Amino acid sequence: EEITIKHELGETKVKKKPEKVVVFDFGVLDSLDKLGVEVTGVPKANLPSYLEKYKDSKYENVGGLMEPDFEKINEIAPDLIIISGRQANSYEKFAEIAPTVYMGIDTKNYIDSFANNMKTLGKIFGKEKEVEKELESINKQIEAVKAKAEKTSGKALIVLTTGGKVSAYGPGSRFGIIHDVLGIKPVDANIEVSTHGQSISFEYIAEKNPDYLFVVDRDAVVAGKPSAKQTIENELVKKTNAYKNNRIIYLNPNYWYLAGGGLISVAEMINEVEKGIE
Ligand code: NI
Ligand code: NI
Ligand code: NI
Ligand code: NI
Ligand code: NI
């Protein structure tokens, strides 16, 4: 009962409704959760807060996002492994074990890549209609939030913080969904697209002078110690418009940094943006 999945790192033969599924992308995991697909293995060490249910002992622990337990994955003998960018370089190692499908977000085409990802899950697991229905809800959600976005001028800047350090994201970056999809005008639409982004300090923020500053506290999740407010709210930033109108929006990093590209995380992500401009 096979299908063949063409993805960014190859073509994979997969049995439909595969019995034992190992997942290394949290967008995918949150997608399968939404669709009521049972997974077998997850990297429990990096599980986002909203996916804490996958710590349960009924799930196998296949290590961490960056440190797969390849011996264990072998012991499990899965019918399907699903990976994303973080594990792109280990594709071969996973493919040697079991059918490995790679799933990424093309950040020039966030929504299209997102939709194809979900539809592919729809095919593997027989959830085409379910997936469609959820994609349509996120379509509506997007429309509503665009309408509000276009009922104001106001320019957003999106930043990330690791321990003091600060960096910048714009159209077609990992966080560019704010601009590219949700109708928020950028402060700067020429930022370097890396996926840890152009580095900046506090003089760039002040002079660009954003009305909304969206922040993602990396060290909250990755170090286990939240540190973003301490860093961002200081003299050098405190008299931008954003600070004043109380429009520094601290985006939940468990969706924005750890996960995303999933039914739940994308829906949830769009929600934090809506409220941040309500
Ligand atoms: Ni082990
Ligand atoms: Ni073992
Ligand atoms: Ni090779
Ligand atoms: Ni439809
Ligand atoms: Ni509301």
Side-chain angles (χ1 to χ4, degrees), residues 156-258:
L157 186 75
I158 324 157
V159 295
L160 188 159
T161 69
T162 261
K165 213 83 172 188
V166 173
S167 33
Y169 300 80
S173 64
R174 65 188 296 186
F175 304 138
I177 186 169
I178 291 172
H179 304 136
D180 296 339
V181 175
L182 292 182
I184 316 300
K185 300 151 68 197
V187 134
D188 188 0
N190 284 289
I191 299 168
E192 156 150 298
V193 183
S194 47
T195 53
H196 261 77
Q198 181 199 312
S199 211
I200 61 163
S201 95
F202 310 78
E203 290 79 24
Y204 165 104
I205 299 169
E207 200 174 7
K208 282 292 187 175
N209 190 23
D211 314 294
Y212 320 84
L213 191 72
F214 292 101
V215 188
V216 186
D217 188 354
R218 179 170 176 294
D219 294 354
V221 294
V222 173
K225 289 173 182 182
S227 62
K229 195 152 212 164
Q230 228 301 257
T231 304
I232 288 299
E233 285 189 354
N234 63 59
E235 180 181 349
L236 304 156
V237 174
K238 268 198 185 167
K239 293 220 290 292
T240 39
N241 328 359
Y243 180 85
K244 298 175 180 193
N245 304 306
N246 194 356
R247 295 213 151 280
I248 296 182
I249 304 139
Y250 291 107
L251 299 175
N252 190 343
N254 301 267
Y255 300 103
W256 289 82
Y257 190 72
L258 273 187

Side-chain angles (χ1 to χ4, degrees), residues 6 33 47 74 113 120 130 147 167 187 210 219 241 257 268 271:
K6 298 161 195 172
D33 190 66
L47 270 166
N74 263 291
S113 44
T120 312
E130 255 234 71
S167 33
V187 134
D219 294 354
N241 328 359
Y257 190 72
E268 182 49 50
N271 225 307

